[PDB]
Amino acid sequence: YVKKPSYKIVPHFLGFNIPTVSKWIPIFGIWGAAAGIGALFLIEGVPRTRQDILSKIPIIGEHWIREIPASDNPF
């Protein structure tokens, strides 16, 4: 015979609990990747982005190493 139902209250805050939030952790990860890719894409034209980030990527990075010949540059 069972006298009482068997349960606990899990910690919660603002209607979030750890079981639920843990299911969304990977989704935040992907959104963060999406935001990272998008941000980097937006500033791909910025020279510093090319100099510091994009030109350092292996294989692909030579796409961003481009020199104007000194003969063709007024400045």
Partner 1 sequence: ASLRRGYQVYKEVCAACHSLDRIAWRNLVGVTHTTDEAKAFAEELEYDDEPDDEG
| Site residues for partner 1 per CB under 8 A | 70-75
Distances (CA, A) of 23 to 2, 27, 49: 33, 8, 34
**Residue 27 main-chain phi, psi, to 5 deg:** -65, -40
Nearer to partner 1, 9 or 70 (CB): 70
Is 41 one of the binding residues for ligand XP4 (CB under 6 A)?
A: no
**Applying CB under 6 A, which of residues 20, 42, 43, 62 lies at the interface with ligand XP4?**
20
Quote the CA–CA distance of 26 and 72 in Å, as a whole number.
50
Nearer to partner 1, 38 or 72 (CB): 72
